[PDB]
Amino acid sequence: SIKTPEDIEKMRVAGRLAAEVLEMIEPYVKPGVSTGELDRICNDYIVNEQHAVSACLGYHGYPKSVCISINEVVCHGIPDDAKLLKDGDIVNIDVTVIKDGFHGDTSKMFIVGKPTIMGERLCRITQESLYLALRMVKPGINLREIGAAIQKFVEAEGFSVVREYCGHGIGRGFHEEPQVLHYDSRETNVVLKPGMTFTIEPMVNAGKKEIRTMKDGWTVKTKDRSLSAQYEHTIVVTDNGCEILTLRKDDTIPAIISHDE
Ligand SMILES: CCCC[C@H](N)P(=O)(O)O
Ligand SMILES: [Mn+2]
Ligand code: NA
16 A cells, blocks of 8 residues: 555654654653553553554453563563563563554663663664664565565574564554565565555564463463563655654654665
């Protein structure tokens, strides 16, 4: 699907709101706070101030407003009032907002209190694998190349790439074509074109790539219980590159990546 300039403008707004949620929640990610409380703050902010709504709530039955994953949890962790954060924890908060009918999906890592050396390294490499993919996006490039580039980098830095979950198209629909794998697959063959909008959300494990899903049907963990990190951005392919729709002040990459001279 190719988004019109109208659709794209609406996605800038939605993406911006999703990013502002992460920028707002940051000071609250402290030792002692529960993930259930972090979820309420995000939701109250999304509904009461941004006047938008979470796309996560109700999606295939998802019970909360944002996904919060800690340490070995790979993704889709469910906020809970009894789960408290502690020093060393690495935490991902994934936000998806719907505004004016369009989605904005983004997530970032937060390290609680005193960081662990490997925890910091894992988050750093994960974010760079996303940045690397983002600087690649431009018409002509194949999604298979993007996934191969992410995997090559991640593996060269001593980590692994989760295969089961991937990025995805997005717009009026939460998940739309195409699938955005973060590794090289023979299944992938998609030449990017301007107007396409999708997400890139690499999940990187400190240990092995294998994962497992808990009985709740949502919580995904690393099979070997090693740490897992993830960063995600929503973008739109431009005539000569791409525009990040969910950029935050702490991002060290500009919103528009143009390959023009
Ligand atoms: C609550 C459903 C999870 C939706 C996540 N944003 P993704 O599908 O990008 O992991
Ligand atoms: Mn996503
Ligand atoms: Na994790």
